[PDB]
Amino acid sequence: AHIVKIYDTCIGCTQCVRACPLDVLEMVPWDGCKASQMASAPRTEDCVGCKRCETACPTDFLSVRVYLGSESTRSMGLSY
Amino acid sequence: DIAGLTPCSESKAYAKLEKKELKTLEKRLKQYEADSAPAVALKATMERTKARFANYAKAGLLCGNDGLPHLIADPGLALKYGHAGEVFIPTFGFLYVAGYIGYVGRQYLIAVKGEAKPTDKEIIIDVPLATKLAWQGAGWPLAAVQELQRGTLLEKEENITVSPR
Amino acid sequence: ATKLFPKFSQGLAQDPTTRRIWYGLAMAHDFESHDGMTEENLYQKIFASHFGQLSIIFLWTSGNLFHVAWQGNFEQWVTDPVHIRPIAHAIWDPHFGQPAVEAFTRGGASGPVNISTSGVYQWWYTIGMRTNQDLYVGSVFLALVSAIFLFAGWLHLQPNFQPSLSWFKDAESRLNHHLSGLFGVSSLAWTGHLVHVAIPESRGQHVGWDNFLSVLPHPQGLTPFFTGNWAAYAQSPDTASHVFGTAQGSGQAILTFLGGFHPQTQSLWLTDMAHHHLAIAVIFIVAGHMYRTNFGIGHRMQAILEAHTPPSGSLGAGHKGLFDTVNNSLHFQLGLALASVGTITSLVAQHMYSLPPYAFQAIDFTTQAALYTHHQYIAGFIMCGAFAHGAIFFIRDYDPEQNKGNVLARMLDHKEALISHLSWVSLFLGFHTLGLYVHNDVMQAFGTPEKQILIEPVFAQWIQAAHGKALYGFDFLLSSKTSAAFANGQSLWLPGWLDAINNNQNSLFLTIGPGDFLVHHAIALGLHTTTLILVKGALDARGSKLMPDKKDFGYSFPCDGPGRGGTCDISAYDAFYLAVFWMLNTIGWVTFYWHWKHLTLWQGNVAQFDESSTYLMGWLRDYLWLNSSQLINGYNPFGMNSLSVWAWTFLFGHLIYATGFMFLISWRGYWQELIETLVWAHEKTPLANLVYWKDKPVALSIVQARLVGLAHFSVGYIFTYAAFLIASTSGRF
Amino acid sequence: IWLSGMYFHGARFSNYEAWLSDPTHIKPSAQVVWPIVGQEILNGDVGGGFQGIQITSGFFQLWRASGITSELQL
Amino acid sequence: PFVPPSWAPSVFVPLTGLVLPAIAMATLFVYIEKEAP
Amino acid sequence: MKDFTTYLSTAPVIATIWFTFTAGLLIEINRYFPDPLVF
Amino acid sequence: WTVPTLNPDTPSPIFGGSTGGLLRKAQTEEFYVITWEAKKEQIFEMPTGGAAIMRQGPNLLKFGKKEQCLALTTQLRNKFKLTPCFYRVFPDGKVQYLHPADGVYPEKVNAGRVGANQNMRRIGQNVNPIKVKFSGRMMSPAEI
Amino acid sequence: EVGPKRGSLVKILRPESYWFNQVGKVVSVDQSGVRYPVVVRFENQNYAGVTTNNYALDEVVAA
Numbered sequence A: 001a002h003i004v005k006i007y008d009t010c011i012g013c014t015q016c017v018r019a020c021p022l023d024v025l026e027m028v029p030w031d032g033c034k035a036s037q038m039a040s041a042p043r044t045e046d047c048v049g050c051k052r053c054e055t056a057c058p059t060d061f062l063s064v065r066v067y068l069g070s071e072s073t074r075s076m077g078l079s080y
Numbered sequence B: 001d002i003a004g005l006t007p008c009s010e011s012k013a014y015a016k017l018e019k020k021e022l023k024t025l026e027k028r029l030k031q032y033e034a035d036s037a038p039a040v041a042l043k044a045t046m047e048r049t050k051a052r053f054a055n056y057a058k059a060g061l062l063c064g065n066d067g068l069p070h071l072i073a074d075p076g077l078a079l080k081y082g083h084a085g086e087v088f089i090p091t092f093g094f095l096y097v098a099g100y101i102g103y104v105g106r107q108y109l110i111a112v113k114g115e116a117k118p119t120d121k122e123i124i125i126d127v128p129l130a131t132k133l134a135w136q137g138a139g140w141p142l143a144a145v146q147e148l149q150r151g152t153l154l155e156k157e158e159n160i161t162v163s164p165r
Numbered sequence C: 001a002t003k004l005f006p007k008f009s010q011g012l013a014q015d016p017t018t019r020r021i022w023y024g025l026a027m028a029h030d031f032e033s034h035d036g037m038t039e040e041n042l043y044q045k046i047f048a049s050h051f052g053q054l055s056i057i058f059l060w061t062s063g064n065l066f067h068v069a070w071q072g073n074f075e076q077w078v079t080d081p082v083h084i085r086p087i088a089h090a091i092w093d094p095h096f097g098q099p100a101v102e103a104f105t106r107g108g109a110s111g112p113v114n115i116s117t118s119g120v121y122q123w124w125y126t127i128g129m130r131t132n133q134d135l136y137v138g139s140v141f142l143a144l145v146s147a148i149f150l151f152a153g154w155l156h157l158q159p160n161f162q163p164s165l166s167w168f169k170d171a172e173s174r175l176n177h178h179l180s181g182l183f184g185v186s187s188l189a190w191t192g193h194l195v196h197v198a199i200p201e202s203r204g205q206h207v208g209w210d211n212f213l214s215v216l217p218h219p220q221g222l223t224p225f226f227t228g229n230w231a232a233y234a235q236s237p238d239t240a241s242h243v244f245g246t247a248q249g250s251g252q253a254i255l256t257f258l259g260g261f262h263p264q265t266q267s268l269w270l271t272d273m274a275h276h277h278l279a280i281a282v283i284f285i286v287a288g289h290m291y292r293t294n295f296g297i298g299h300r301m302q303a304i305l306e307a308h309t310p311p312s313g314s315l316g317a318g319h320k321g322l323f324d325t326v327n328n329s330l331h332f333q334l335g336l337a338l339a340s341v342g343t344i345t346s347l348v349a350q351h352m353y354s355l356p357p358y359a360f361q362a363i364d365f366t367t368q369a370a371l372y373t374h375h376q377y378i379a380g381f382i383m384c385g386a387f388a389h390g391a392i393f394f395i396r397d398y399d400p401e402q403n404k405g406n407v408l409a410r411m412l413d414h415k416e417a418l419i420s421h422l423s424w425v426s427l428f429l430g431f432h433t434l435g436l437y438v439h440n441d442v443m444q445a446f447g448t449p450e451k452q453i454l455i456e457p458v459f460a461q462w463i464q465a466a467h468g469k470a471l472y473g474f475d476f477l478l479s480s481k482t483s484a485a486f487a488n489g490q491s492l493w494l495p496g497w498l499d500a501i502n503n504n505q506n507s508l509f510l511t512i513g514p515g516d517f518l519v520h521h522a523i524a525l526g527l528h529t530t531t532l533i534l535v536k537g538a539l540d541a542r543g544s545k546l547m548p549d550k551k552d553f554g555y556s557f558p559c560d561g562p563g564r565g566g567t568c569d570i571s572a573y574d575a576f577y578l579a580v581f582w583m584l585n586t587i588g589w590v591t592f593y594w595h596w597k598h599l600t601l602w603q604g605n606v607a608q609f610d611e612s613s614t615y616l617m618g619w620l621r622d623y624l625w626l627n628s629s630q631l632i633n634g635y636n637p638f639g640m641n642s643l644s645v646w647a648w649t650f651l652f653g654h655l656i657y658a659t660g661f662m663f664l665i666s667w668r669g670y671w672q673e674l675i676e677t678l679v680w681a682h683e684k685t686p687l688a689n690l691v692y693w694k695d696k697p698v699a700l701s702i703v704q705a706r707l708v709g710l711a712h713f714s715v716g717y718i719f720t721y722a723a724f725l726i727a728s729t730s731g732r733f
Numbered sequence D: 001i002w003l004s005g006m007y008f009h010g011a012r013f014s015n016y017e018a019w020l021s022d023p024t025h026i027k028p029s030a031q032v033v034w035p036i037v038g039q040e041i042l043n044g045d046v047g048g049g050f051q052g053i054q055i056t057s058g059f060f061q062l063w064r065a066s067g068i069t070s071e072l073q074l
Numbered sequence E: 001p002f003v004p005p006s007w008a009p010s011v012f013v014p015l016t017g018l019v020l021p022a023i024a025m026a027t028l029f030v031y032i033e034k035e036a037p
Numbered sequence F: 001m002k003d004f005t006t007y008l009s010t011a012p013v014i015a016t017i018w019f020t021f022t023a024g025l026l027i028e029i030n031r032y033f034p035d036p037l038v039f
Numbered sequence G: 001w002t003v004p005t006l007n008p009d010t011p012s013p014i015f016g017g018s019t020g021g022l023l024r025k026a027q028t029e030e031f032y033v034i035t036w037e038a039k040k041e042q043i044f045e046m047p048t049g050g051a052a053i054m055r056q057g058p059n060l061l062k063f064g065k066k067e068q069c070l071a072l073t074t075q076l077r078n079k080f081k082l083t084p085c086f087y088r089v090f091p092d093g094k095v096q097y098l099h100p101a102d103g104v105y106p107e108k109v110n111a112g113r114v115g116a117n118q119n120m121r122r123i124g125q126n127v128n129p130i131k132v133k134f135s136g137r138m139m140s141p142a143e144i
Numbered sequence H: 001e002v003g004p005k006r007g008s009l010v011k012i013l014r015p016e017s018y019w020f021n022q023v024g025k026v027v028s029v030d031q032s033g034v035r036y037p038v039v040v041r042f043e044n045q046n047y048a049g050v051t052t053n054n055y056a057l058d059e060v061v062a063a
């Protein structure tokens, strides 16, 4: 499975979660930003690696990173 | 002479090449009349060919075994055997025009950089300022050397963006 | 479920698609990336791989010797090495019809055989092989040596025979033994073979294992060596009327420095080669006692490295810490080795065509063309590999904390300046070379060849005049008879060297003109651009402004996605990928130049090259179009000849190249969607859905696609040029 | 504008009048080049006492089919 | 001597071209699809 | 007229006028000085 | 809040069928089932091609992968303002609820969630690959 | 009151940032204990088209 990581520079803008097309990211409470929210990746087993979340991240540099890992049926997005 | 080459004024292949070009032009000219436009055009081309060959031989160019001229790129050989007009003087001429264009562009960029919207001055050229800088760029080597001596030509290391290594 | 293959990667083994097979095949040699890999095990695996490679090399050499002794005509080629073509091996193809059988039946054989272009005949004949029995004995000996190497590779992996980790890091001992033993003793042994076998065999005396212990190589018998009167060994050398292989006009000297070439064979003297190997053997042996290993005396490479920092601070910390970052990094050592190997390979190609070392090698035009092109392409690939491994070193083994302030860190400190200056050099060379070529083309098209720009290469011609060539007329150094440099060699080697360099019938410092100047600038452009791509990819491998964390993604990865405007071909692997095309283009230009200049020299009309090498139309018509008339005529409706195989290879390479263009232009997505449609079609087809796949069919990955397209491009390129070169040179001569 | 240019070139820089008298030997041409930097060599002898570039657009045949017999009409 | 017979190519070429590649291909294909316990 | 001059001051119009002027100058120079190969 | 139970006897939208439907993976590995509540009949676009008509009330559909179900979920939420939910169904009959995981959509923060795979540092603070070399397998410097 | 003054110009010291060694105008400084309270707006956008970012107190130097 691919490795999805969230760094402390996350501002809790929730744009990466909305851009995720396979419901991998979510928002959890936090105390490091004004929004008091932080992105989380508790379902990385379903991530394909489209990197839409990285495109939707507005921090410089990015707060969410995707590292291509072991390929499987869910990671390759195969309907067969 | 230099590198076993002979001057074009004393090369047999050079004269044979000139005779070949004039022969094919004259052969093409024999198919037309005498007071027609193609005949006058061909005669003009022949006169241009004669003037070109005479000027090349008059310039003192060095020809090879193929009858074609050769250029001397070594500064010592060019200044020692009268070949500075081939590659030396045009080199300095291009250096002057190149630095001229570069300095004009640099001055325009630095001038519009302190304005409110430099991107508008980049897509829409400010013709008066550009014309003034184009006319003032004649002293580009002097201005560039004075800029280099003052230390204002280059930017400091701390003000330039770099990779995270 | 999880499959057994691959055994070194559980993640790849769990992959249920066809990507598992391709990735397992492409990552088998990546020992550092396996499961449960340590440093000691890594070095042991590389040791075994080295032994296996040596066994393969020796077995291949034995196979060549065996086929030349069996199906070759070496016994008849040695008697007439000017009018007899060498035979590689026989051909047994059931697809051949009667015309193919009689067309390939050439070279005095009894059946269809292949005419060799590798030049092993001249080399073996020069070193001493005369009969097929010698080749058979050599093949058997090399096969047994290969078997011993294979057994050694298997033995070193078993317990009680695996070397320790500290043994593999003994740089001082390994370098002393390679400089003194693998380099010096081997060269000394070659000198012994040349003096004891090659030199007596070239003079009509058969010296073999049955009589070398009773035949004296010199009439004085080792006495001048012990008495210090070595000058007696150069007395009575081979005269100018010596016939190779016979005793007519043969001398008695064994170590001379006459220089030049042999008048008949047009190759280097055997005595000079033996003397050369002896001198370099003495130098390498002496150099083998430079590092301290176990006897107190010697040096430590770490001390020499740490004691080389300038006081002005220009190099920062100098070379401090370079010993640890090199001894602990295998990619750094591999990159250094590949860089040196590629440079030496190019040196070999240039020195062998200009200074022929094997007898009757200059007359074989096909051998020269094929050997030079082969070595140059191999050198280009090896150079690209050196830079690729350098990038791998930066991503995997570079440690900024250990390399703080040294030259290595300072390379990444000003990498932008290096890439920018390389870009400026490449841009200047490209614009000027292309501009001069287009200008000459327009002048030739407008009927005014005297108007084209023809700059005389006065610098290289000046160097040639310094070497002794008097055609230009500079008359200095070895060209002037009153110079000390000239008068100091007139009694040792200058007569033969000057006689060979002033002769325009050989490849020793050929005459150059404006066409040579222009093509040399094109060569410089190719070298600088290839270096720019490789250097930029190695320095930007750890990160740039677009990808600040590229070091955390490995050496090879597809991309960073379409975000930030697009990150296609952002990895260092992609930089190497784009650099392979430039390497192939550069080697293509150098091989085109070599082939055309030598073709015009062998045809007796160098003026054709001198007059048509200044405009690209001359290169396209007088070289590529004029020399392919016989190649494409190998098979036509009127029949076929022995040149039909090269025509088929020509079209074969063109097809492979065009096939590579597909993987290079079309990308994954379209293919994956098409594959999905095919999956549905197979799953919904009766009498066929009963046969289901064991691996889910998927499209090739982006990295795999780049590699496949590059492989097809390179294979088609190589096969097309090799076929055209051999066919044109063989048909013309 | 493109069609008007083709007709103007056929009316002032062509040999249509000469081509009409010999449509089997005179090559059609409707473009002339200025005598600069040696490009005048492109003004080949297309026939009918003219020097130009042989055209392949087929405008001469089309004008002959419509009944055009003079440069004034073009 | 070490010289092979006259019929050696007629037997070794079809072997190396059809016997050895078929056996090697079948063995490798069976090995790749082996399921781990 | 201010908008028209601003449109004429854009990058493509200025590039067209400048390249036309430079090309015309080079063409006229080669016309009055045919075949210049040296100085 | 309670985890919903899959009702197999749920009406499905009127669709004529297509070739982009389920494959052998639905019977051999797994498949997905999306259910939602529609206030009225409406023609919607199928993620696998074609236009179907969602019925009034409960609606159930089957898809080959999770991406298709989430794409249809996003389409129904953004075009008709509905609340869909889906499960992963195995050939043995096991049903696993997937989205929304806690009954609340992940775009908004909800109490009880625990952040996972979060690094309490930035990208520039990651270690060099030489420090993560010679591990059990290929490990990236961001995995630690 | 902690941090740079609103509207001033500061230099970015974050190496992985696109605006490293570049000047940017200060927008607002958060008064909480967040890791990156300084907000810096730049005239030139990054590759993603963003012109604002959040930096720490020690990540910005007055220039």
Ligand code: CLA
Pocket (backbone or CB within 6 Å): B074, B075, B076, B077, B078, B080, C458, C459, C462, C474, C476
């Ligand atoms: C871009 C690289 C470049 C290269 C490859 C050369 C190469 C050469 N130059 Mg040179 N030169 C260059 C740049 C270069 N030059 C530049 C930028 C200048 C401007 C300062 C000069 C100015 C120059 C002069 C004035 C002369 C040469 C000369 C020469 C030729 C022989 C001298 C030599 O090799 O020493 C390198 C050259 C120099 C360090 C410049 C000083 C000249 C040295 C001291 C040589 C003079 C001694 C004597 C005249 C040599 C002639 C011996 C014999 C033939 C009579 C040689 C082919 C000599 C020549 O052949 O005359 C026709 C000569 O006199 N060059």
Ligand code: CLA
Pocket (backbone or CB within 6 Å): B101, B102, B103, B104, B105, B106, B108, B109, B125, B130, C420, C421, C423, C424, C427
């Ligand atoms: C103000 C204009 C200007 C100036 C002073 C420079 C200066 C420089 N450039 Mg550069 N460049 C420019 C414009 C300019 N460039 C433009 C418009 C482009 C896009 C085509 C490039 C693309 C470019 C590349 C790819 C490279 C350079 C490089 C370099 C450096 C090497 C010298 C060189 O001649 O390279 C070559 C110059 C060019 C290829 C382009 C020249 C274009 C014209 C002649 C410049 C003026 C055009 C402009 C429209 C005029 C201003 C209008 C204004 C008065 C109204 C040098 C410091 C090299 C480098 O990296 O540094 C070592 C290098 O690799 N430049």
Ligand code: CLA
Pocket (backbone or CB within 6 Å): C046, C047, C050, C051, C054, C167, C168, C170, C171, C173, C174, C177, C178, C180, C181, C182, C183, C186
């Ligand atoms: C005198 C002792 C000695 C000798 C003879 C060798 C010899 C060798 N060692 Mg070794 N080694 C030694 C001591 C020695 N070692 C010690 C003491 C240590 C421990 C400190 C090591 C540790 C060690 C390691 C770790 C490895 C080796 C390896 C090798 C092999 C290198 C393979 C190769 O590159 O081909 C031979 C290379 C040459 C002959 C040099 C060629 C020179 C240039 C490139 C060519 C020029 C020649 C000429 C122009 C070309 C001929 C033309 C024509 C005839 C074709 C080689 C056979 C490698 C190995 O194990 O392979 C199995 C390797 O992995 N050694």
Ligand code: CLA
Pocket (backbone or CB within 6 Å): C025, C026, C027, C028, C029, C030, C031, C334, C338, C381, C382, C383, C384, C385, C386, C388, C392, C555, C556, C573, C576, C707, C711, C715
């Ligand atoms: C002494 C030479 C040497 C050695 C020991 C290595 C060793 C290594 N290289 Mg390397 N390399 C070299 C030279 C060398 N290289 C050269 C000369 C080049 C330039 C071509 C490269 C370019 C290169 C790249 C770009 C990469 C490596 C990588 C690697 C590492 C593992 C990958 C691997 O080898 O798996 C096995 C290798 C293969 C399966 C080869 C692929 C198949 C090729 C394309 C065969 C195609 C030929 C074709 C079939 C010919 C037939 C035609 C005919 C039928 C008509 C490994 C440590 C990789 C790495 O470091 O991992 C991150 C990596 O990405 N190398």
Ligand code: CLA
Pocket (backbone or CB within 6 Å): C423, C426, C427, C428, C429, C430, C431, C434, C525, C529, C532, C533, C578, C579, C581, C582
């Ligand atoms: C014939 C094909 C071709 C050509 C011409 C080039 C040319 C170039 N490559 Mg490239 N390359 C190619 C194929 C080609 N490549 C392929 C197949 C690959 C593998 C993917 C690569 C991969 C590659 C890489 C990775 C790199 C290059 C780089 C470069 C540049 C090198 C600098 C130079 O030489 O300056 C000379 C400039 C030229 C030759 C440009 C041509 C000049 C034109 C003809 C003049 C304009 C005509 C006229 C005035 C206006 C006409 C336009 C009209 C519409 C108005 C150069 C522009 C390097 C680079 O970017 O350098 C900084 C670089 O890193 N190449």
Ligand code: CLA
Pocket (backbone or CB within 6 Å): C655, C658, C659, C660, C661, C662, C663, C665, C666, C674
């Ligand atoms: C000459 C290079 C080349 C070749 C051979 C192909 C071949 C093919 N392309 Mg392709 N293509 C190319 C260039 C090429 N393309 C390039 C440069 C691009 C980029 C624009 C594309 C983009 C492209 C697209 C977008 C598509 C294709 C498709 C196809 C396939 C069509 C099916 C077919 O033709 O039936 C037969 C196959 C062939 C004619 C290929 C050669 C087969 C040889 C002659 C048979 C030899 C058999 C031999 C005995 C094998 C024994 C091996 C032995 C060693 C054991 C086919 C395999 C289409 C497809 O996917 O399939 C429908 C598709 O949509 N191509």
Ligand code: CLA
Pocket (backbone or CB within 6 Å): C056, C059, C060, C061, C062, C063, C064, C066, C089, C090, C091, C092, C143, E004, E008, E009, E010, E012, E013, E016
């Ligand atoms: C690497 C060296 C090499 C190469 C490239 C060739 C190539 C060839 N051989 Mg030859 N052969 C070799 C070594 C080699 N041989 C040796 C050392 C011997 C002595 C035992 C022979 C004995 C031999 C005979 C008797 C004949 C050939 C023949 C042939 C031709 C037919 C194809 C064939 O493979 O036949 C068969 C090849 C063999 C039986 C040799 C295999 C034995 C070695 C030890 C195995 C090597 C294993 C290999 C390295 C593992 C990897 C290969 C592959 C599985 C990936 C072909 C051109 C035939 C011929 O003349 O055609 C006209 C023929 O009759 N060979």
Ligand code: CLA
Pocket (backbone or CB within 6 Å): C094, C095, E013, E014, E015, E016, E017, E018, E019, E022
């Ligand atoms: C690399 C080894 C190799 C060898 C040794 C052969 C040998 C042969 N091929 Mg073949 N071929 C090959 C590779 C090879 N091919 C490849 C790679 C391709 C794809 C490009 C082809 C494509 C091909 C075609 C299209 C044809 C051949 C044909 C033939 C036969 C020639 C017919 C003839 O004139 O004789 C006389 C014929 C006979 C005496 C009949 C012999 C019957 C068979 C061949 C032997 C008995 C079968 C045997 C028991 C089973 C062996 C399978 C084994 C691996 C388990 C011949 C025996 C022709 C053929 O099949 O003949 C009808 C033909 O049509 N080949």
Ligand SMILES: CC1=C(/C=C/C(C)=C/C=C\C(C)=C\C=C\C=C(C)\C=C\C=C(C)\C=C\C2=C(C)CCCC2(C)C)C(C)(C)CCC1
Pocket (backbone or CB within 6 Å): C331, C332, C334, C335, C336, C339, C340, C343, C386, C387, C389, C390, C391, C393, C538
């Ligand atoms: C990336 C990288 C790298 C690098 C690489 C490289 C660096 C490559 C290259 C390159 C090359 C490939 C080089 C080479 C060179 C050479 C030289 C440097 C030389 C020389 C010369 C001389 C010195 C000579 C002299 C002389 C003459 C002139 C002649 C006569 C003789 C005499 C001797 C006198 C590595 C891996 C390390 C690691 C890190 C990263």
Ligand code: SF4
Pocket (backbone or CB within 6 Å): A006, A009, A010, A011, A012, A013, A014, A015, A016, A017, A038, A039, A056, A057, A058, A059, A062, A063, A064
């Ligand atoms: S888009 Fe980036 S900053 Fe915004 S919540 Fe997601 S990870 Fe955090």
Ligand SMILES: [Ca+2]
Pocket (backbone or CB within 6 Å): C128, C130, C134, C201, C206, C207, C208
């Ligand atoms: Ca013997």
